[PDB]
Design a protein around this ligand. Structure first.
Ligand SMILES: *[C@@H](CC(=O)OCC)[C@H](C[C@@H]1CCNC1=O)NC(=O)[C@H](Cc1ccccc1)NC(=O)[C@@H](NC(=O)OCC1c2ccccc2-c2ccccc21)[C@@H](C)OC(C)(C)C
Ligand SMILES: *[C@@H](CC(=O)OCC)[C@H](C[C@@H]1CCNC1=O)NC(=O)[C@H](Cc1ccccc1)NC(=O)[C@@H](NC(=O)OCC1c2ccccc2-c2ccccc21)[C@@H](C)OC(C)(C)C
Lengths: 188, 188
């Protein structure tokens, strides 16, 4: 069966409601004060987190070496609470998955779970006019309001929901190497 | 934890999408060709079931001995498929419950699960101007589109979602005695 228990533990301890100029998004906290949000959320220098205005200390819109959108933006937030470190639940590599759950945490849906079935390493997607890479696909009619939703299997947090076409849903991959402690680089 | 596995088994085998003049509702099939739907769905002599026009052979809008709305309408449908008999999962008596799940099956949400936490035997509710009895209440911000949604705990199907006020959700109780094989009574 789908790993509902795992999805619930991730949602309970590692999600907040984020709100930008573009609306509300489920937001996955990954470690310390670092979280993710879809790039098309258009994060600025402040953001609402559970309706509390919060400084965005850093925001990195990920792109691959072809200079193509990956649709993940990693943010560092000025908050007191640390997120439980869930980096060990992130996949090392691209993969396909079975019996995944999509989990949403917004004002409208504070806690909701959708089994999306098989998830395929899809690759290239034209997302609302933006070429995008490293997309995961599931055959489920996902809707507006579900962006940022966390895609899991038991023991793995594999991506965040970013798009759909009325029949299929698409998530941006999360990989373990996106969040490893590193060194010195001018990035803005 | 919440009984997601049980909720999923009920949804998989015992729900259809019903559509009346008032819109779409999750519809729980109980046994044979007998199902339930909230009375405010305004069931007529035909109904759409998974988008297929279907004759409604009988419809009984339940009321208690005070002649007050219970908000459950039991329907008998002209379909080929029988529903798996789930009467043994229906509670005998009114009760309070822990860690319930609300499960929705509509066109917009073909499969969605919401843990609603504690469910209380609430009693009287004024439902959109209609006095209504035998209501179950949960502290969860349920929304339009969730009516008919099935409320479960492990091993019990306890009600169907009928209402909310933005902070709380309300279900009409299901009791085992609503569906027992009986005898001869002019009811229309
Ligand atoms: C989540 C964010 C949101 O609700 O918007 C607020 C600004 C939302 C989820 C999806 C909406 C529809 N169902 C969903 O699962 N994502 C988007 O709207 C996303 C942009 C975005 C905005 C903000 C944050 C993150 C993302 N855009 C779309 O999902 C877009 N879909 C899309 O481009 O799909 C690709 C299609 C494609 C590729 C190749 C050949 C043919 C097609 C095709 C045909 C028909 C439809 C889509 C595609 C949505 C907005 O596009 C449609 C046309 C479905 C409305
Ligand atoms: C499901 C059916 C649907 O979507 O409508 C299509 C016709 C829907 C679910 C609920 C909507 C809001 N959140 C939900 O969970 N149910 C209804 O709309 C239901 C009527 C119905 C129509 C068709 C089938 C089955 C049912 N009506 C309401 O839910 C109504 N809520 C309500 O009456 O709550 C009682 C309130 C009460 C009692 C005593 C003191 C104070 C109050 C109070 C204060 C403020 C709000 C409600 C109540 C909705 C429609 O009413 C509001 C005002 C929330 C819009």
């Amino acid at each position: 069966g789908p790993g509902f228990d795992f999805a619930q533990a991730i949602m309970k301890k590692n999600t907040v409601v984020a709100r930008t100029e573009k609306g509300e998004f489920t937001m996955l906290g990954v470690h310390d004060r670092v979280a993710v949000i879809p790039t098309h959320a258009s994060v600025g220098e402040t953001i609402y987190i559970n309706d509390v205005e919060t400084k965005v200390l850093d925001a990195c819109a990920l792109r691959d070496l072809t200079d193509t959108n990956l649709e993940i933006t990693i943010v560092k937030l000025d908050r007191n609470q640390k997120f439980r470190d869930i980096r060990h639940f992130l996949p090392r590599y691209e993969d396909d998955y079975n019996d995944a759950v999509l989990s949403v945490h917004t004002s409208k849906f504070p806690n909701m779970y959708i089994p999306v079935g098989q998830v395929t390493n899809y690759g290239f997607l034209n997302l609302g006019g933006t070429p995008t890479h490293r997309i995961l696909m599931y055959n489920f009619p996902t809707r507006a309001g579900q962006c940022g939703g966390v895609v899991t299997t038991t023991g793995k947090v594999i991506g965040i929901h970013v798009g759909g076409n009325g029949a299929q849903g698409f998530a941006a991959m999360l990989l373990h190497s996106y969040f490893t402690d590193t060194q010195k680089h001018h990035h803005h």
